[PDB]
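Agenda item 2: adenosine-5'-diphosphate complex prediction
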Amino acid sequence: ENKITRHEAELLSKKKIPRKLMEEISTEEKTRLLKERLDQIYLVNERRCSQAPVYGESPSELMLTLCRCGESLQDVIDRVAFVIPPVVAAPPSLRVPRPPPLYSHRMRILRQGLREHAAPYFQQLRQTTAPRLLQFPELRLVQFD
Amino acid sequence: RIERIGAHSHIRGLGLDDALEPRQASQGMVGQLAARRAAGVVLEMIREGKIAGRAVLIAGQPGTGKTAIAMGMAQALGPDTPFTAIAGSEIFSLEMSKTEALTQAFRRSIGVRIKEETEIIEGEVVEIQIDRPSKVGKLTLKTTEMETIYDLGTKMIESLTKDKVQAGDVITIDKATGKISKLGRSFTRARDYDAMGSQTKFVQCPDGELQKRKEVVHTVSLHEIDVINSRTQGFLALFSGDTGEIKSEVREQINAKVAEWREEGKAEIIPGVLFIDEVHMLDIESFSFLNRALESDMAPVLIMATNRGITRIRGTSYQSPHGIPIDLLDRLLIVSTTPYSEKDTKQILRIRCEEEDVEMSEDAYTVLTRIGLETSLRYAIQLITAASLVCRKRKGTEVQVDDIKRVYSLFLDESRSTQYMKEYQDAFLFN
Amino acid sequence: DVTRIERIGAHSHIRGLGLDDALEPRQASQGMVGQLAARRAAGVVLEMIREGKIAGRAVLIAGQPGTGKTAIAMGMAQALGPDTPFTAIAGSEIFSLEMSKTEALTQAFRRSIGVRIKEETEIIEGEVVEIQIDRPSKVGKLTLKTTEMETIYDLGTKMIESLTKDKVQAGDVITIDKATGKISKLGRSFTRARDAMGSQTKFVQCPDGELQKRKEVVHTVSLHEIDVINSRTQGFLALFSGDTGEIKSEVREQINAKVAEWREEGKAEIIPGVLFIDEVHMLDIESFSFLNRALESDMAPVLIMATNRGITRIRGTSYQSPHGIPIDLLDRLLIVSTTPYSEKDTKQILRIRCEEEDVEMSEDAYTVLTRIGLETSLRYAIQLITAASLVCRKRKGTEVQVDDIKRVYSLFLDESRSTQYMKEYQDAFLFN
Amino acid sequence: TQRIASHSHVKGLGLDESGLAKQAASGLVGQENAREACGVIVELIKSKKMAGRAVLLAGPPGTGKTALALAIAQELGSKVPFCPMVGSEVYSTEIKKTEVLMENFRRAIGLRIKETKEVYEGEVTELTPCTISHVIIGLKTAKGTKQLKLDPSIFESLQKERVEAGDVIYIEANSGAVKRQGRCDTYEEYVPLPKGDVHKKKEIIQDVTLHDLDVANARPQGGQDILSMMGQLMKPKKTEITDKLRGEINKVVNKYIDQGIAELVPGVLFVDEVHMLDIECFTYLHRALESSIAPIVIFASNRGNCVIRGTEDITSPHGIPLDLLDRVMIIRTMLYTPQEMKQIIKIRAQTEGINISEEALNHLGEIGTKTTLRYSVQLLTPANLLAKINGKDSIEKEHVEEISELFYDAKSSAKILA
Amino acid sequence: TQRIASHSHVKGLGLDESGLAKQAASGLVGQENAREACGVIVELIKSKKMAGRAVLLAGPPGTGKTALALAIAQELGSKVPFCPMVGSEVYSTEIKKTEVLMENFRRAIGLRIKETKEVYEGEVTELTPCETENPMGGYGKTISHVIIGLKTAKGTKQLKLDPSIFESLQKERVEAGDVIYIEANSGAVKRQGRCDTYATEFDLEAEEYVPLPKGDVHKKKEIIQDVTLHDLDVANARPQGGQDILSMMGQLMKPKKTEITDKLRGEINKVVNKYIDQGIAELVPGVLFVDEVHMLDIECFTYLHRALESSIAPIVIFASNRGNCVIRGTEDITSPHGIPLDLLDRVMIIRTMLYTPQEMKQIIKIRAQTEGINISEEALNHLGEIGTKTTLRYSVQLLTPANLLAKINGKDSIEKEHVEEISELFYDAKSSAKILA
Amino acid sequence: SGAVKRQGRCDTYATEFDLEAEEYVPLPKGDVHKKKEIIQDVTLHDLDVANARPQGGQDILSMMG
Ligand SMILES: Nc1ncnc2c1ncn2[C@@H]1O[C@H](COP(=O)(O)OP(=O)(O)O)[C@@H](O)[C@H]1O
Ligand SMILES: Nc1ncnc2c1ncn2[C@@H]1O[C@H](COP(=O)(O)OP(=O)(O)O)[C@@H](O)[C@H]1O
Ligand SMILES: Nc1ncnc2c1ncn2[C@@H]1O[C@H](COP(=O)(O)OP(=O)(O)O)[C@@H](O)[C@H]1O
Ligand SMILES: Nc1ncnc2c1ncn2[C@@H]1O[C@H](COP(=O)(O)OP(=O)(O)O)[C@@H](O)[C@H]1O
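Presented output:
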């Protein structure tokens, strides 16, 4: 059913907002290897919507306290946050017999892609969405003990 | 200054003596003496704060200070006690169910006060030396009583070097937190160099011993606790107000934990007050939900306002007194407001003139009072500042009754407007 | 041979609003027949649009169904020609699950207005013979030898990393952005092909002469494009997916300010357009209320509506009104009407279409079909023309004869025939 | 062997080459006027020289409208693109109705393309990174050796695909593909290195709808952009397609046909039971159909001149607005006679392979006439099963009397409730 | 410049200094009492004492009030902001109605932030320490302070720099031949780029050399800007942090609007009060105009009671041409202009009257001047008749098509026959109704 | 759970410095390993919900979810 790699006047990858590639397009199988690809990318040259973009302040006074009697932005957070979920569950894992190596390859490629991209901020992200699992009431208990 | 002279700026309280007898004039208020009595009783009971779930409604003619009564109440209450006023139409939202909105308002009204001891030191930056290679550090401080010298912590080293504090300054550090705060420069500190650098004022050297313990107290609302702990980094949503369907298990867990913190002297709760305007704007669903919303212990007193009479229940075809189903009606008591008298109107208008700081003729007072009585008080309140502007345009000071008639002619009133619309009914479509 | 996506449609027979230069509607021209009053008004409106000096003008077209109002709109839009912002849409599109109808109307208007813009680039290019790896020493062997010339230069660290990451090769043809220095990849040089190394990568020969050269370019974008592009980080893919929504009014105000600024600079030039909305009567009372004020705004491209109704309730209220439109919005607009065609006009249109179909029929069949269309409707005859052409092909004959039309008319009932058929036979079908 | 469906019996139209209708054939019978009425428009679609035509089938309940449309589709064949659609399904909760209508139109039109491609495979064992301007792999382990003009960057990029010895990749030179059949453990799935010239190819005929291309280019493919890696995970949403995109595709599509490689073929969109549409959909139907690229469309309904949805006060024939009714052609189907009842049941019985005593058959035909056709036909298989319990091969009168007594139609039920 | 708009002709209320109304001024006629009332309103706005007051205009179809509000704003000038509004805007699918109302009120209050600043600029000429062994003990290899030779286009100089700042300038890429942003009182320093002078001789210079600073080093003058506190709310409510993971996460999702909590509003109030009382900022409260108030529902009127009562609500105006119709949302309730009686009670009102045909002649003359199109008198009288029977706008639109027809004829002025063919071409309310009838 | 957590620093180092910020606690008085039973109680609703949205696990796909 063909690849349909041609078409896709969507990627805008070869940004080239000028159609100047039109000039080159106008200008054994070498002749075919040239002309066929020249047309194949000329049909892409119509993708000119990237540049000539016409782009274009910073009060950022401060994140004011939420009425916490002076100090704020951490003491309230670490004083109030105590909730623990009753239950924690692992993601479901599908059980299949010997699976195709092609799906394995694609999913593994995705597994590669996710890191590096996330690596620089993977750590920063990992500090978050790690819901607390337990607490430890301090010797403030000694009050009633 | 952001404020501006408002319709209800003249209100400053309720003007009730110690025995709760209203005074014929006090903190900008007079009239409805029975209403003032009842409101004083309500405020007293709120101070008592020994009971929950009570509710009360105010009914009467429109434009008879019901909102003014409520605002005087809120003013006299004080800032310590939490308070919140909202409009019936505001609950209807496209982000959440109405019941969740009512729960959010309720939890907002109530407040919690947390008490906790502190441990801090503060003094001059007598001298500091840092010894980058880890970093070795030595430092000393002092106060108006004695002086001391201490080593320097590696994390203390990072903290201070990021603070980039200058020797001779006055600062305070907490041991447990290890977070420093500059509290204003000192004579030697800001004596600075020959080099310009900057210019600044000074602060007095601290006193007493460096270490001070000391206790700090804070306050937060129940809804705030709910939101902050709800999504685990739902904290920023507090401002965005994007909180949705805060689950019930969270509510009960917070209730349990707050109760147990409470009975152990850790903190003290405070029963807030919540006022809803145009309560008739609620449908039957909200009536049903709030009807039970009063049994939960965390029940701030409610105050409602509406002037209707035997009106269709919102969302149905049933006429009821003020359009509120009898089930609620039997759960609360009422207060009525009468239309004002003659001389009291003179007093009110004189008070508003004082508010505006525009002092004018006596005949003007008589004529304007009679006109307002005949038409309405609100139109008189509108005419006050208009006449002031006209007279200032005359370049004189004392507004004259002729000027009052001029302005009155300039701005037709409700009765005149309908009389006009009658003068040519076909002027405007859909009659 | 080659079949186009386009084929005979309800207005394929219309090329343009063929009419006299002096705005004298010709009896017949470019498929425009009859309704010379409407044609005259349309010519005046078209030309006053062409001058484009008064904004916020509303034109409404009233009349009967199947009187060519859509045909007139198509003809005048054709006359406007390309390279001029013209937009047509139905009244049902304002309703969406995402953006309130107000913002839908605003986006429609912003689309209607069009703009043009030009700028000079003055970029460098050529063919690098080679580059020495700047071993640390940003001295790149910028041997950008065009067919005539050559030179060498430095090579900044950003430049070195750009060349490396793009994995450029020596003896390649590449063009270098002047200010940005972006290595706009272009492939390799003719040294292989007019050796020739064949693969997936594109191949280019060597350019000539001045590596630095100037190139003035122009662009055209409705205000909608600027709004969406500046709406967020990646508004372009929002356009491609058409899934944007609720662009802040503040953004649009800023855009209006800055586009004016560029305009008076001599940078930008406005190209106002015409907006046509069909079946306005299916538009809410909110739509009319909002259009009352939207037009009064300066940037108000002219508007065209369409309807045939008489007195109808306003959608959202129980007030009957002319064409089911509030009187309030009418007094801003003008009324253009039309009347049913006569015998000869119907005959001429039927011809026009038959020739459009490239079909041959007996003159007597033409006349009897004219009769039938007169009694029944125009659309019935229009459809029957192709139907009978196909039938007569099945006959293995050349020209359409009257018997063919009689047979085809027997085959398929018109509106009235089946309407009455149910009228006596309503007892059979379901729900009346 | 597949499950037997209602309309499986139909196979065509039974119309002589002249177009005249045999009384019964190909699984159809009766309604010759309609049968020849539909056949001609089938050949109209075969013409492919027109667009925007509209037809509507108005018949009483169970007069074969669904059968007629399928009969039309069967005569058309698979080559013709058919995309059946539903009147009531338009009301959704994802995008407005007009978008759905446009989307259905778009996938009605199908496009075929043709090409061919000379490949590489087989010889894979040896693998050298060699940096030379042309393939120096000397790829020869099964049949022969080959050389090609690929630069050093090509070798390494290929070597970047963890390519190992003798694992055949269907690397189409035009593509430079890496279609690794897989590693044999010897390096035990064995990549069978075929003999003959490694240069292999085969013609390919590919058919694609315009709607699928539209969706294809409406959103990013995700994998292309590292900032679009998450493109995959987000729940996939269907969003309105910007009009310019459809305008743009039409431009690019037109180009390809001009290049003598793309060959369009208009399709037919069937909308059943149109009388469930509201007024607003009708309105957009007017303008939508006007498009000079609108494909052929066929409606269906049996409603009378009852009120129109949404309008809540106006009635029109089949609840279709008069203006819409004007611009749509009409065909009608009448009732049937007991003789056709016998004949239809004979075909349904034959298709199901069920034998009926002639006495039983005629009596059942009588029962169906008492109540209806559809109810009678439903009873076929049950009775056949009664005979199975008693080992009887064919169906008899006693079984039918048993079946009918057991169940009760709507007509009888109507009186039963009272 | 601009294609003529429906109100471009108007340029000012044109009230005499005494407040009285010149009969015609900057495109106005009649309604002298209305003009004087608008004068009083602009006086009240300039007073700035009052707060939360609002008016409503009652006038027949053919709004006109558009012109009155526009002239009010024009007299107000640009010193104070002002925003329009249309009733349909309230019906939004992203935020609740009251959210839109409170937001539009918030955007109507402007502000003016005045902030002074000081910096030292130039090109780094040299750099030296002030070495001294005086410090206690140790090999006396110590720097008392640094000496930095800086040059602007004005000239060159050097200043005394404390020892600590050398570490800072290490942090930045400080090198001979580049310029820097040395905050005098704070000590902020940056590295713009190398002096353009070097690039001058450069045949290729990929980098972007900063030019040489001009003027004295000791200056950064006073910065100024204005905003609507709604923009402040938008900026502060959602922290920007475009680099953080959360920023990528946001750009994944489609940006939208969130119902901003009221505590953020109260906090904005507090902080702006703190800035203003220090004199840093300046508030310029605006006024608001909402047309076809009749298009609203009961919810919004009831909420408008609360919004108006507030002591922060900027002045606002409305307009309606609707009679005693049934209030939307309300099944039956009818009131003048579909406004509840209670809301009507606590608002002002002004009225407009019908217009006499002579006034039509005057306005038409003004409009012909505006378009710059000469008119023959017979056209004036004929169109006066037309407007007499028709409405004003109907007669007004006929101007440009007729002018154009005349241009086709080669004429310049429009005449009676031109307007005759224009009249037959297009139909009025009654003629269009009859032909419909 | 794999839950990982810190309890400040050991009490051995209660003297190295004098103003070091982080606190100190003493060495545990029990074995490194210990396993104790507990009468936990939960509703079936919470079981369902905890399974439905897998906050557990640590894979990056799960984290993104
Ligand atoms: N007795 C009074 N003393 C002082 N001010 C009053 C008195 N009665 C009314 N007012 C003023 O008039 C207004 C009356 O409005 P109100 O009746 O409270 O509105 P609503 O009917 O919405 O409750 C108040 O805001 C107050 O400023
Ligand atoms: N004067 C005319 N010349 C050519 N075609 C016409 C004319 N009047 C009507 N038509 C035909 O009528 C068809 C539909 O007309 P349309 O614009 O839909 O009428 P209406 O606007 O009343 O629905 C068009 O395809 C057009 O070919
Ligand atoms: N001449 C015929 N040949 C074959 N089947 C027929 C014939 N006439 C009617 N039918 C049957 O009648 C049934 C009608 O079904 P359907 O199309 O769903 O109802 P309707 O035709 O009312 O829309 C079909 O199953 C079809 O097989
Ligand atoms: N409804 C109205 N009431 C009073 N005067 C009006 C009205 N409409 C227009 N006018 C008068 O017409 C002149 C121009 O207003 P115009 O631009 O026509 O407003 P609109 O287009 O909204 O009717 C103004 O001088 C004004 O006095």
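Discussion summary: The interface with chain B takes residues 66-69, 71, 75-77, 79-83, 86, 128-129, 131-132, 140, 143-144 of chain A (CB under 8 Å).
Owner for follow-up: CH.
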